[PDB]
Amino acid sequence: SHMDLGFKSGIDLLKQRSTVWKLSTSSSELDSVLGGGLESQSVTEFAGVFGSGKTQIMHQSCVNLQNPEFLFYDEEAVSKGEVAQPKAVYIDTEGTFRPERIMQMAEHAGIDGQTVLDNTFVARAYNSDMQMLFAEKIEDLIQEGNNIKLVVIDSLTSTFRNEYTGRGKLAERQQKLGRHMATLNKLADLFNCVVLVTNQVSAAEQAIGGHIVGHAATFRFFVRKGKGDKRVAKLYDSPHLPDAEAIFRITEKGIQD
Amino acid sequence: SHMDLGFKSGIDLLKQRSTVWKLSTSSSELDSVLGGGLESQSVTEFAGVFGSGKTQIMHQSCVNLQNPEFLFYDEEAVSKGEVAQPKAVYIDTEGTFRPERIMQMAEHAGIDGQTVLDNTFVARAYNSDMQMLFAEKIEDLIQEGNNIKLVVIDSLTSTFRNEYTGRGKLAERQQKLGRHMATLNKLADLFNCVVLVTNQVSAAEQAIGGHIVGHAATFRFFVRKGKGDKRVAKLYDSPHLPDAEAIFRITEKGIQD
Amino acid sequence: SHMDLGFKSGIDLLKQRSTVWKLSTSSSELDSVLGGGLESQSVTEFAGVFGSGKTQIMHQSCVNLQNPEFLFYDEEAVSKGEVAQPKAVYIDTEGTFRPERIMQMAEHAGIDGQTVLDNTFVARAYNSDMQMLFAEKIEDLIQEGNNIKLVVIDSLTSTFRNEYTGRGKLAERQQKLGRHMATLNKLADLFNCVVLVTNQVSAAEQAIGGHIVGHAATFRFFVRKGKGDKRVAKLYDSPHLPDAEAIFRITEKGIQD
Amino acid sequence: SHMDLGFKSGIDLLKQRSTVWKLSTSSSELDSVLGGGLESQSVTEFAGVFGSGKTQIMHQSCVNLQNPEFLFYDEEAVSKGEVAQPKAVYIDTEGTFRPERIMQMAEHAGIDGQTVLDNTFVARAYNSDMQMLFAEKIEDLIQEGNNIKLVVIDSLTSTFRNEYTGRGKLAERQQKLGRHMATLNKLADLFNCVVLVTNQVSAAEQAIGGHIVGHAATFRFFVRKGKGDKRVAKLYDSPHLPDAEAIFRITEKGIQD
Amino acid sequence: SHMDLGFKSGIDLLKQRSTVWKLSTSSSELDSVLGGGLESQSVTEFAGVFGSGKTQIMHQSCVNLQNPEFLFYDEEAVSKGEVAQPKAVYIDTEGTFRPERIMQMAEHAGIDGQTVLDNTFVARAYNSDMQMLFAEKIEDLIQEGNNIKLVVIDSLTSTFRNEYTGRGKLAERQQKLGRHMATLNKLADLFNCVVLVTNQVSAAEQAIGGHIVGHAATFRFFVRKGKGDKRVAKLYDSPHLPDAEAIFRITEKGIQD
Amino acid sequence: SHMDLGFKSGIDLLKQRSTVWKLSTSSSELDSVLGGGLESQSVTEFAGVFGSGKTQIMHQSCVNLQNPEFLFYDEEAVSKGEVAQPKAVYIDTEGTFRPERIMQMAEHAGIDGQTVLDNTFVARAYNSDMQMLFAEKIEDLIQEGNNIKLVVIDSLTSTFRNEYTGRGKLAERQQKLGRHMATLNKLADLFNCVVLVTNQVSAAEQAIGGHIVGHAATFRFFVRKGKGDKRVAKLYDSPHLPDAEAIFRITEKGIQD
Q1: At what angle do helices A54-64 and A99-109 cross, to 10 degrees?
Q2: Is residue A37 classed as helix, strand or coil in its secondary structure?
Q3: How many C-alpha atoms does F221 have within 13 Å on its Cβ side?
Q4: Distance in angstroms (rounded) separating the CA atoms of residues E96 and E205
Q5: How many CB atoms lie within 10 A of CB C71?
Q6: How far apart are CA F243 and CA B72, in angstroms?
């Protein structure tokens, strides 16, 4: 009864810790910094400038979800049915979803592009209202028998930024964002899935949204452009992992190395 | 089912791509820059100064909609009925609709002007509330048996600009705009129509409304005055078309060359 | 069913045009500048300083409405029944209605004063709420069988200006005003009557209200004080008439010359 | 029918003008400046500094209302029942009602003080909400069978000034005030009574409340202190009376000369 | 019927003055300056710095209410039944109620302390809403049969001051305060009880809350510290008493001299 | 009857004091400064910079709750039943709860860590709404049969601080804060339990939230860093204890000295 009130005993916390599964990024170093891969029941943020690869990682994650081998879990804790026919939701904030990139990534990966597209729900959000409502509707998707295992918010803050210009209404912006973050954390946890969000950085080195976002994101990264198609992801916040940097590349095959 | 919620599988996206039809502008160069013509399912923005041709293109579009040969589409994906007895909605926020100019453009196009007027609904909006409400009521018009295939918003921002003065209400202005842009995209998508919007520019060049408007418009142009009756439309934003310029003219015949 | 939704076809607009009737101002020059007289289906604004004659023109219009020979219309487009037993509504925001001036003007015009006073409804409005509500209640007067054919708002902006002092509530002011402008245009349109409004000006030359008012008034005048009882009305905005000035007098008889 | 809607024909306006009655102020010169006495159906304002005699005039009006001979009216237009058992309402905003002063003025005028106190309702208002609600409830007092013929608001702006400090809420204060003025004029008009209000002045020389109050007060005075107990009431605004000054005194007998 | 609407005839007002009773403060000088003691049907305010004795006066009053000889009234206007089993309500804003101080004052006064504690209702208010609701619930305590004859608000403004920072919120703070003052005056008046409030002062010399409070407090004191155990209460606002100072002391017995 | 209305007689207050129990902090000096231990029916605040020991005290309290020898109470006033099977609520605002730390503290204290984890409900709050709602839901946990005797709010203000930036919202922040403080006090009082909260400090040494928080917290500490693992807890606000400092240490066993 208590868990229905949003509470969890210390024992409930430990138990649920065993049902955590992870999704590979197709990058050795990146998976390593992640301590296995992208964790479920948590929100992972990739913040950087445009072209840094935040969106590539999002597309790559939708493809990988469709490869049974890219999902790592404790067999005696997570049944094979729990992760069967896994579906992905991609909330698109600026029209960044590219089906052809999904195909390309699928092909070079030996996955059926057709299947990734068929199992990835795309929601085009033109304002913060839609963005937040789509997130909440993910429960409805799961209620219609869709095993949503990956939620992608690309991007987390552009609609809020575009709607709240002026530090005179920043509090209203922060509260709405905090509400969205609670929703994102709620579905990662209640539906044992991984939630990923992309974000931008401001002038001195912080992801947009302040602490309201930061205190609510379990894993946080800054993504920088190396030379050429190289990228470096820096994990600077995680509950128990060490801060570390991982280098990788973005090619015709997607995320690699 | 998922579609009921606003989500589209990647496969659905590809499928909807096939039903996109285009409307000619009566200018080869502009049509070529558009990659064929003004696209259904998208919001196309024409931004420029007063007298730059924005309103003329809107009128030309209403006339052209009444000539079957001016609509281009895949006869394998779009039935004749889908585009039969097509009608236009012209939401006029400053009193720019001119039935006599419609008559003229039609006459010179070998199109009956009476037919254009009989199939063009004009909605005079004196404030932003009326403007947004009219846009929402387009669904009610369709539901009455009117095959709306062209929606013109001339102009998109004059009302919002006349109401929200001072950067102290900008947030509210931006949120109302975002709501309007969402509705415009919804009409274009759910009813497979072409949605055109005219807009102004501000001081190195930007269409009024910032990113809330920009991010939500699929095709964006800046229209400039050339010598005499000449004009140049510069497409600077599109999903996959190259950024190019097209020259054309505004004559007694309408848009030409 | 479309007109029920506030939409009108191009054809409906032309048909609309055929039923327009005009009201003489008693000034040959002003009538000429107007293209015959004050048009129904449009809002006509007279802006200027106190004493420029705006209020005098409003009273003169109420008197002239009671002279069948001062209403010009196409007999084959408008029945004598539509313009029969015409009544006026005068919404007064500063207590400028003078029954004695009505009497004096009538007498000197060979019109029965009592008939003018008996067919002129006066509404004293002390704030914008009353002002706007009276305008909306004009529809109710009509249902009860009153052939309202002339609506006077003297003055248009006095109350809004007295309530929304400070450019900090200007946005709300502009929106309330836009709502009122829409209602005034609706009365003129739906009930085929002439709507006149008085207004003030400010510096380097503009009627109070900005574009929210400007875009919503079809005929716009600046009225200036000439020498003695002479006045000059300058039409600087109309759909198709030329910009021109008219000189007249305000005498014991009312508007003349 | 049109009466229900707040509208009145020019004829009704003239008619109602015949039912106006006046209340003597006990001062010959002041009664003369007033054109006979304080008029019913109008709001009369007395603005001045503290100690200028405003409150004394309010008390003297409550006393005089109980002497049948201090009410002047057209016996052919106003019935004796209309002015029978007249009662006053004194809305007290700073605890200025003084029953002993009523007693003193009454006896010195040969009126039974007990009768005055017995027919004078006092409403102590501690904030603007109470002040306004009390004024609206005067209608309910009349609806219960009380012939309310005099309404005193002492003072009109006191509570508004105390509540709306800072000019960032001035618009809200001006609108609330405008709503209050509407109510005061409504009771004067609908129940044919005299409404008196006291007010303060500020820097040059203007009653507090601006035009919102000013356009809504039919007769306006500035009361000044003369030598000793002498006072001068200056009428600076009236519909058809000349602007003039009246000197009078405040003694044990009340207002005199 | 008029009283039901909040109005009172002038006769009513006089009838009410006769039922006024007073509560001794234990200080000869203070009682003399008050005209006999703390008056019922009025709000009495003691303003000053921390340690000036405001709270001690509140405590002494709760104790004194339980000694019949400390209540002064006219037997012909107030029945012994009306003042029998009197009870006090103490609204505590910072946790200043001290049962041990009550016991002490009682003991030294020959009054049973348990009787005092048993007949004193304490309400700990942590914010303005609770403070305001507690005052309104006093009516409910009375309806339940409790003869509430004294209400202490310690302090009047602490919560309001803690919740409202910025001159841009001052308007809302003043209106909430005005609503609270209305309630305090209403219970003093309707239930014939004495209402006491403590307040702070600010720079030049005024009690916090401005005129909204000042205009609504019938008796007002500034309480200063003298030498050692001495304190001076200065009555500077009363409807009919002279402005005067009372010196008293805060001792083990409580208030004395 | 009055208990329902939120009022407590002075006798109720004394009787209430009789049932207060205290919880050991495992620090002899700190327990001494506290007059015995953390008191039920009160809110105790620990303010200090990050790493000062606040969160550690919260964890140590959850652990100590499960050792009956650490709860001190009057057996004549409090039954073994009231404190039997006590449970704790830990509202986690930044993700600071650590089950492993709970295990370690228990283990080294001779307490079964599994028992502590099993009887401690954790609530992760990502915004002020959630934070406040969990607090209120504690009534539900108790209703469902859980003997909640310890409530931890870690931290009290990080969410409010992250949501309300700028002085233009400070009033709204203070009021939300006030409501939350009232709720915390209410559960401490009604369910006879200990309520602990952690807070930050700013600039000239004050806990965040100002007086709105300060006035509502019965025991207030500023916790600072000594040398190495030493810490000093300074009690600067209590109802009857002396202001004093207690040095303690944070080690593998937990809070000690």
Answers
A1: 60
A2: coil
A3: 29
A4: 25
A5: 22
A6: 85
d(CA D12, CA D8): 6
CA A53 to centroid of chain Cα atoms? 13
Handedness of CA D53, D54, D59, D60 (dihedral sign): positive
Tokens of A213: 């976002």
Report long-range pairs for F223-229 (Cβ below 8 Å, ≥24 apart).
F223/F46, F223/F47, F223/F48, F223/F52, F223/F53, F223/F54, F223/F57, F224/F48, F224/F49, F224/F52, F225/F49, F225/F51, F225/F52
CA distance B17 to B14: 5
Q: What is the resolution of this structure in A?
A: 2.0
Pairing of strands A194-199, A148-154: parallel
DSSP state, residue D197: E
Torsion angle of alpha carbons D235, D241, D245, D248, nearest 10°? -90
Which of E220, E223, E222, E156 is closest to E184 using CA atoms? Answer: E156
> Chain B within 8 Å of C208 (Cβ-Cβ)?
no
For chains B and C, count residue pairs whose Cβ atoms are closer than 8 Å.
99
8 Å CB contact between A206 and A220: no
**Residue C131: which H helix or E strand, with range?**
helix C128-143
Please name the method used to determine this structure: X-ray
Task: Test A170 with F172 for CB contact under 8 angstroms.
Answer: no
Conformational region of residue D226, where left means phi above 0, alpha means psi within -120 to 50, and beta covers everything else: beta
First to last CA, chain A: 47
**3-class SS of residue A241:** coil
Q: How far apart are the first and last CA of chain F?
A: 47
Max Cα distance, chain E (Å): 54
Query: How many domains are contained in chain C?
Result: 1
Residue type (1 letter), C19: T
Q: Omega into B155 within 30° of 0, i.e. cis?
A: yes
Q: Are strands E201-202 and E194-199 parallel, antiparallel or unpaired?
A: unpaired
DSSP string for residues in C90-111: EEESSS---HHHHHHHHHHHT-
Q: What is the extent of the structural domain holding D90? A: 1-257
* Residue C28 CA from chain centroid, whole number: 18
The secondary structure element, H or E, covering residue F224 is: strand F219-225
Contact between residue B236 and residue B218 where contact means Cβ atoms under 8 Å apart: no
Specify whether the CB–CB gap between D188 and D40 falls below 8 A. yes
Question: CA angle A90-A91-A92, nearest 5°?
Answer: 105
Cα gap B109→B113, rounded to integer Å: 9
DSSP string, C190-214: HTT-EEEEEE-EE---EETTTHHHH
Asked if D181 contacts C127 with a C-beta cutoff of 8 angstroms, the reply is yes
Distance from CA of B160 to the nearest CA of A (A): 14
Interfacial A residues in 75-94 facing B (CB < 8 Å): 89, 93-94
Could you tell me if C21 and C72 are in contact, meaning their C-beta atoms sit under 8 angstroms apart?
A: yes
Q: Rounded to a whole number, what is the distance in Å from the CA of A39 to chain B's nearest CA?
A: 24
List the one residue out of D38, D72, D237, D69 whose CA is nearest residue D151: D38
CATH of the domain at F64: 3.40.50.300
Strands E8-9 and A230-237, by their bridges, are: unpaired
Mutate which: F127, F140, F164, vs A, most A CBs within 10 A: F127
Rg value, chain B, Cα: 17
Pair of tokens at residue B230: 């000449």
Report the half-sphere exposure of F87 (CA within 13 A, side-chain side). Answer: 19
Whole-number CA gyration radius for chain A: 17
Element (DSSP H or E) covering residue C64: helix C54-65
Could you tell me which residues are beta bridge partners of residue C121?
C89, D9
**Residues 6 or more apart whose Cβ sits within 8 Å of residue D227:** none
> Tokens in use for F124?
């992760």
What residue has token string 């505590």? E92
Tell me the three state secondary structure of residue B101. Answer: helix
